[model samples]
Target: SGPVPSRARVYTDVNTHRPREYWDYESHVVEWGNQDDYQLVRKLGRGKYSEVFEAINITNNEKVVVKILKPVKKKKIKREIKILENLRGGPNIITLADIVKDPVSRTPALVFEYINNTDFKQLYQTLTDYDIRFYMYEILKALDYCHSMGIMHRDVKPHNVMIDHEHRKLRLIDWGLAEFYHPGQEYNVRVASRYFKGPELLVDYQMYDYSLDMWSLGCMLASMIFRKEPFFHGHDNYDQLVRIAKVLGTEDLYDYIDKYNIELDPRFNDILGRHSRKRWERFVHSENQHLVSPEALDFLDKLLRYDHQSRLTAREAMEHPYFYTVVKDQARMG
Candidate 1:
């Protein structure tokens, strides 16, 4: 954990510096396209908010992804499209090729640039330590870019990140849960997936900012280095905090609560027991030791803090010593 916030909280993206137009989702005017131009090839994946399909642009024979949004509020749809447009041309940010709607049912769909991504479950197991660093750095570029534009990607995990391993390309996808960050604003605690939920979300701290994504990135990196599919395997929402405390310890949790004056939910009364923080070295073993180093552990430590403000920002993460060797090697070869 880092220093406690002063009387006036210093949000990651202060409102005065943020561009109001970039965050103006309400004023966005969505321009819909003709749905007839594309044909669905097959189902790619499904999520709580949309059904993703592999599709093709008939006229140009170009490959694309068609996300058939599930029944959601019209405002949600507009916000996503607007955010996508605002983030377009940024590093590794998923491109929105078109916005379409079904003719009869009038169902809305999003057409995106298709990426040749292998399922992360299979991909992570096969990655070399260098590969992990390369992709992680790439993804961080996307995160930092979005954060610079005053946006927070609430949901960040292996599934939302698409990696074209053959081409060494990485793209951060799924903006449905992403929102613009405003100082002192309360956000939904239910935005991130269970295992990847940050301490702020678990503690019901609504004033979280871009540092939340760094926590999720830590979850992802920990899993890869430990060979654990989920670094924190929580069965439910309440248990999620328990699982985190078991690794990070309860003392810091109490410190964070006291600093913020957060009221931990009643469910935590039993599950939230005192636990000593486990060492990062404890996770190292034969299978994953190759990916584990002193620098890596330090980087992970800074990211997986109990306090959100203490988590490393994307840009800072890229500069960590863990990536220094990788960058040096690239420079030497070039």
Candidate 2:
């Protein structure tokens, strides 16, 4: 059964650094099969270890997004299930409607509300600069709330974001890589999409915090409006860092590179020192700007700084002067 949701005043990136408390070497709530309440409709997609399908609840006839994982693993899946269960009911987030199992097939299906329309990535291929700006603003708002709750959605990409194309209602989804950063704790592994990844992650690996998401936010916004991945791409991480170093210019980030450093991997020395602040000036300054508004540029600049600490928190990004003059109520409510 679903629980009633509570209203919340959202904020920027958030972190609690709480670990999943192990229960008897597994999550105590693990189940063998999917919920028996829903009937399958159609296959949506498939992953290495899971499959997602559309389904209708037999009891209420309500539509749902059902994801079924392989029957082999229980610990990781259970933890993910708990994470999703904990994040239900937020407007900026996809609502997890229910959880069920198929008595006949014995597959676990996680159900969620169905979101329509193309993602930012797909929409950008066709959207004019005006529409991109409008949609990007909404995404920033969503990030503001996620950050406020201490959650860092490490993967903040267009494909993971669902935009109600008709109404422009933007919903951020896919928490598979989300992390809860605490004040004093540390995380040391590098995990993120190549394009949206920040220099800090490349150089420091795991020494940063929620600001990483801000960097991704900047990249995503840039990618959508500019129709390109602002950074480099060469089929590998080293090539990607070269792209970042080029635009950012070759500056030694070692002085203050602990809490949030941008040191390149040792293997990336060949592509070293190409930070072209001049070429990337248009991204920050008001010179030869593209289809986006000045406000949008300002937001991107604030979030995409080379220094992770200087990066804007999600809440602060939302409260920025960029959004001040614009009437959000009457503006695109995406």
Candidate 3:
């Protein structure tokens, strides 16, 4: 009902004009698809929420990803289904082809278009500066599309970004933590992974919006440019803020928390002493210098702000100078 305390910057309800059913999670009814239509190929990966497998669709003889959910509440499951349905066919968003359940165990699974993706850990090493910017620009299309439709991808780490480098295809997956944004509604801060969490989440400010995704992207970009697996590398959640403050400066942290009227977690009282912001240039080394550049650092700076509103929106980020060549090339190809 009111503006977030941290900053005057506000994103007007992007979906206020949208139909209620599109954003309404609880009222959604499951229209489960047939489980017999698909056959398992092999294990793909697993996460806290689901077991993943590579599966074959008998109907079309096409490969797909089967994400079988662990026992969870119906509302959470419906939320993911509804959001995916709402975002179907949008640029770079994962395509949800079907929803099925194991007939005996009644376990629910989501079927998505398969991507022959390589892990970013290995893939980032091989990427040129052009490759890094090119893919990052591609992801902004997905992020911007989702945010415009009133959804936020609460989890935006490298693992959730699937890249089929051969085809030059990218898909944003794992929408379990994703939610629709309603202005003034308090949301769970316990969503994103520890390393990629935004400053708003770390400070326990729950009214965060699409800008949170930008912060996660900022973290991912930092790692790619600096060649660190996780740019923050926090040992724990409490320590995560300390890691961020060390680089962004403790003085700015104080200003941020004070702006939001955020009560510092008591555990941080001792650990969070004063520190100055570290310069981006300090991260450049012989190994990663090729990936680091003035424009890349500037783009990173705009996305990593302590105040959520200060961070660039997904649409605005795509227009940044870091992507100047990629945008030009994309337009030329069209």
Residue runs of model 1 more than 4 Å from their true location after superposition: 1-20, 329-334
lDDT of 2 by residue, 1-334 (tens): 2211111223321332334442122545744433767788999778765787888878888877787766856665664565565556654777867666656557666777877757443565556665665566677776666566556678887777788877877778777677655554456546678887777666645546677888888887766545565444546666676666666565633333433323445656666644544433444434225556667667767876767667777667767766664435546856
Q: Mind giving the per-residue lDDT tens digits that candidate 3 earns over 88-189? A: 999999999999996655889999998999888789757999999999999999998988888889999999999999999999999999998887778899
Cα deviation at 321, candidate 2, in Å, is 3.2
TM-score of each: 0.93, 0.79, 0.96
Query: Which predicted model would earn the best TM-score?
Result: 3
Query: What is the lDDT of every predicted structure here?
Result: 0.85, 0.63, 0.88
What is the lDDT for 103 in model 3? 64
lDDT of 1 by residue, 1-334 (tens): 5323321123445445756756777877778888999999999777777788999899999999999987888889888988899899999999999999966447799999999998988986568888888888888999999988778888899999999899988899999988887776677888888999998888777778888899999999999888897889999988998999999999989999888888777758579888998888888999899988888789989999987777788888989988986677757643
Runs in model 3 with CA error above 4 Å?
1-11
By TM-score, rank the candidates, best first.
3, 1, 2
Error of 3 at 162 (Å): 0.5
Tell me, by lDDT, which candidate is best.
Answer: 3
Model 1: lDDT of residue 209: 85
